[PDB]
Design a binder for this molecule. Structure first.
Ligand SMILES: CCS(=O)(=O)Nc1ccc(Oc2c(C)cc(F)cc2C)c(-c2cn(C)c(=O)c3cc(-c4cc(C)c(OCCO)c(C)c4)oc23)c1
Ligand SMILES: CCS(=O)(=O)Nc1ccc(Oc2c(C)cc(F)cc2C)c(-c2cn(C)c(=O)c3cc(-c4cc(C)c(OCCO)c(C)c4)oc23)c1
Ligand SMILES: CCS(=O)(=O)Nc1ccc(Oc2c(C)cc(F)cc2C)c(-c2cn(C)c(=O)c3cc(-c4cc(C)c(OCCO)c(C)c4)oc23)c1
Ligand SMILES: CCS(=O)(=O)Nc1ccc(Oc2c(C)cc(F)cc2C)c(-c2cn(C)c(=O)c3cc(-c4cc(C)c(OCCO)c(C)c4)oc23)c1
Ligand SMILES: CCS(=O)(=O)Nc1ccc(Oc2c(C)cc(F)cc2C)c(-c2cn(C)c(=O)c3cc(-c4cc(C)c(OCCO)c(C)c4)oc23)c1
Ligand SMILES: CCS(=O)(=O)Nc1ccc(Oc2c(C)cc(F)cc2C)c(-c2cn(C)c(=O)c3cc(-c4cc(C)c(OCCO)c(C)c4)oc23)c1
Lengths: 107, 109, 109, 109, 108, 106
């Protein structure tokens, strides 16, 4: 019902129409490759879109509250780790604007 | 003690080494659950671990002492025993590498 | 024909799918000779191949036709049969994945 | 000389090193045209290149000499300068990393 | 709880981030290996970060006022002993700027 | 013979040369100093305490092997570091001491 609407939002963000600011969230942050030593000291529960897609197909979200929480966690990790100036916070805010809007229009 | 952790580093070095490649490789990187088709991996294993992550944590100074380092390596083996049935090959490789580990950890001065 | 490279994509997508993961995983990436201790690997295997390489070449559109695609995927399997003894798990996995390959290739328009 | 391939290996190891990670990351893997929505990338760029590929070729021993390595590492940067307009972040990161490359290549016995 | 932030502060003094200027303060001053035959007459109470670490883990510190006072003892000990010119005074200066700030940034 | 050598060691380790010998007393602690690349660049680590451990062992059969290891410790420090860092200056001040007393050996 609403779970089915949550897919279409998850699809809409994984979609290519926001790929220009959605890309830093398609896969988990690679702290090793990015040479980020403290990423996991600071981020207790990483999240990213692929990991949301995983949990969707396993049916690990019962409600939309659990789905929105992981998507919001993905964004909060980014706002937590990074300083406000960084270009990844600006794309998180653009992608989050897309999400919150699409989530608000849920029946 | 820094002597402990220096020796723990030595153990980690020995687990990653050439000589145990045959049975250590399954633990060089996190379990790629999506690549392996393992839908229920991260519902069963709350706290993944591997030797890449133990090197990272050690390099990062996340290990207060030798016990913290052992808890992780041991956690890596227990997840492997948790997720898998006893007769899968990966359980037999854990046990050989765990046997390398417990010995070296036991012999630590 | 772009039609037959279209079908080579399906073949690959199929080879890479969760369906076959249990025997497909060792061809997902190049053989890491370094990590696995294989000092003679690159002496014996002059032209390594694996499925990520194949995919990269596909997205690159480096395959002039389906025969080129097929020659790489078979090079992958022959590399494996050339290097390993015939009892090794990887050989039995290769034959498992190659039966899938030789079937979907064979049943292409 | 495989002595000059040794140094190119040092160069690569250096380009991949954590020091340059803030500007090297876009070249760590091939450009994902699908994921990024670049429906004209493969029309414009005929021979894509990135550092993973270079490493795989180095391990495969596909490079006859240092010149050949350099042509690939340079194809990576040109490809980037060709596709993108000059204002884009990624052109600025290319030039930054290419400065490390051009320096280290030049300091070669 | 304020001792929980203190421990976070100590975690940062010890991290790779400050390792070009914090290393003099990881172990106690080894006066005899250094040939500092006066150190222990001038510095009646040595301090260093591994002693702060080890005191945290016995719960030696009753409040933040006490954890602060040892990190500061460690810095004063450096300033008390050395000439203003020496490389190690600068390094304590630098690391103290990291301590004084993160201690100030403590919620209360 | 190595009594001349082991007397050279006691002198390098002693208090007279501590203000420039201090970085060579124990092995280089690359983790505590934050040097990821140190052990890939310095294959064979060396330091004076380890030189003392090799001696007590009676592993140094002949004086060249003692000299190659004191020299290696120094050659590691020149190999790893740029010339203008302080620790290359201190290595040079200690190797001056080492060399002008190893040269005066029967
Ligand atoms: C698709 C997952 S990935 O494979 O790990 N790829 C990836 C690539 C770039 C990322 O961050 C950016 C982004 C998004 C834009 C940019 F211009 C530069 C960087 C480094 C990021 C990235 C994502 N998120 C969510 C983050 O929170 C952060 C933080 C950082 C980051 C990276 C570096 C190197 C940093 O250090 C720069 C100076 O040392 C800092 C402060 C933050 O990078 C990301 C990720
Ligand atoms: C180096 C990390 S990696 O990039 O993800 N590579 C990797 C590769 C193979 C792994 O497991 C093996 C191993 C080790 C041997 C083998 F013959 C087959 C498999 C699947 C494993 C693997 C490691 N560990 C620690 C595990 O606990 C498990 C469990 C499983 C696993 C995989 C599959 C496909 C399974 O399904 C079999 C039929 O469905 C089961 C039951 C378990 O795989 C691993 C990992
Ligand atoms: C995703 C590629 S990877 O990152 O390099 N990971 C990987 C992991 C395991 C591999 O091989 C297996 C496989 C498939 C199953 C198994 F139970 C044990 C091993 C070692 C192999 C592997 C793949 N292929 C295609 C091979 O031909 C061979 C050969 C060998 C291999 C490995 C070791 C350690 C070997 O030595 C055994 C005892 O010294 C031998 C003889 C062969 O491993 C692979 C690769
Ligand atoms: C690790 C390879 S990856 O998995 O494909 N990830 C990746 C991530 C970011 C990339 O480029 C950046 C970078 C580096 C920073 C940034 F703030 C935004 C982008 C898009 C790029 C990237 C690399 N190179 C070499 C390129 O030439 C280009 C070009 C583009 C690109 C992307 C988008 C969305 C673009 O916008 C299309 C219209 O909206 C344009 C014009 C170019 O992205 C890359 C790649
Ligand atoms: C990691 C602790 S340790 O095992 O005991 N090793 C150690 C190593 C170097 C130390 O100080 C430095 C520093 C930091 C930089 C430098 F270029 C030289 C020295 C000697 C110091 C050191 C730390 N602190 C906090 C100090 O206050 C002082 C003072 C001195 C010191 C040492 C010597 C040899 C001194 O020279 C005596 C004249 O021959 C003087 C005047 C002061 O060294 C330290 C300690
Ligand atoms: C007694 C063994 S110990 O316990 O590991 N202690 C120790 C302490 C200081 C050392 O080097 C100095 C010295 C001597 C003075 C100084 F002000 C700063 C450092 C880092 C060194 C040291 C010794 N030798 C032999 C070296 O070659 C090097 C190189 C380095 C070193 C350290 C840092 C932080 C460096 O900076 C990294 C970039 O910021 C660089 C480039 C080199 O430190 C030592 C060692």
């Amino acid at each position: 019902e609403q779970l089915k609407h949550c897919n279409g939002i998850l699809k809409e963000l994984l979609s290519k129409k926001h790929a220009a600011y959605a890309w830093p969230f398609y896969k988990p942050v690679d702290a090793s490759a990015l040479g980020l030593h403290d990423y996991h000291d600071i981020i207790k529960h990483p999240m990213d879109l692929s990991t949301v897609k995983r949990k969707m197909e396993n049916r690990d979200y019962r409600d939309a509250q659990e789905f929105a929480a992981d998507v919001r966690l993905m964004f909060s990790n980014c706002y937590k780790y990074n300083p406000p100036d960084h270009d990844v916070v600006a794309m998180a805010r653009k992608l989050q604007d897309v999400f919150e809007f699409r989530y608000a229009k849920m029946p």
